[PDB]
Amino acid sequence: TYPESLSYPFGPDEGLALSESYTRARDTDGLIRVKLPYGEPAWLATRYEDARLVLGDARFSRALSEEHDPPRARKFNAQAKSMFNMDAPDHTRLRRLISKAFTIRRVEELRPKVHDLAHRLIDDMLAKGEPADLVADYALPIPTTVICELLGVPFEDREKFGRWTDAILSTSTLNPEEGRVKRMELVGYIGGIIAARRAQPADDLISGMIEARDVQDKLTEQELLDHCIGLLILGHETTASQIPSFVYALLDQPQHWKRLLDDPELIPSAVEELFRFVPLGSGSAAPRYAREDIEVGGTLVRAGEPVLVALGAANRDGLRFEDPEEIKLDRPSNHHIGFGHGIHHCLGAPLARLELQEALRALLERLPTLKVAGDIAWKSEMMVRGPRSMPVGW
Ligand X SMILES: CCCC[C@H]1CC[C@]2(CC[C@H](C)[C@@H](C/C=C(C)/C=C/[C@H](O)[C@@H](C)/C=C/C(=O)O)O2)O[C@H]1/C=C/C(C)=C/C(=O)O
Binding residues for heme b: 91, 95, 288, 344, 346
307 binds, among ligand HEM, ligand X, Cl ion, none (CB under 5 to 8 A by kind): none
322 binds, among Cl ion, ligand HEM, ligand X, none (CB under 5 to 8 A by kind): Cl ion
Identity of the residue, 121 or 278, whose beta carbon is nearer to ligand X in the bound complex = 278
Q: Looking at beta carbons, which residue is closest to ligand X? A: 281
321 binds, among Cl ion, ligand HEM, ligand X, none (CB under 5 to 8 A by kind): Cl ion
Residues 230-249 that bind ligand X (CB under 6 A): 230, 233-234
Longest CA span, the chain: 63
Least Å distance, CB 383 to Cl ion, is 28
Question: Pick from 47, 52, 62, 72: which binds ligand X (CB under 6 A)?
Answer: 72
Identity of the residue, 201 or 281, whose beta carbon is nearer to ligand X in the bound complex = 281
> Which x/- pattern, by CB under 5 A, does the window 299-338 give for Cl ion?
----------------------xx------------x---
Residues 14-53 that bind ligand X (CB under 6 A): none
Residues forming beta bridges with residue 382, ordered by sequence position: 170
Stretch that binds ligand X, among 45-53, 95-103, 216-224, 280-288 (CB under 6 A): 280-288
181 scored as a contact of ligand X (CB under 6 A): no
226 scored as a contact of ligand X (CB under 6 A): yes
Least Å distance, CB 385 to Cl ion, is 23
Least Å distance, CB 174 to ligand HEM, is 27
Identity of the residue, 114 or 285, whose beta carbon is nearer to ligand X in the bound complex = 285
80 scored as a contact of ligand X (CB under 6 A): yes
Would you tell me which residues interact with ligand X (CB under 6 A)?
72, 78, 80, 82, 84, 168-169, 183, 226, 229-230, 233-234, 280-281, 283, 285-286, 311, 383-384
Would you tell me which residues interact with Cl ion (CB under 5 A)?
321-322, 335
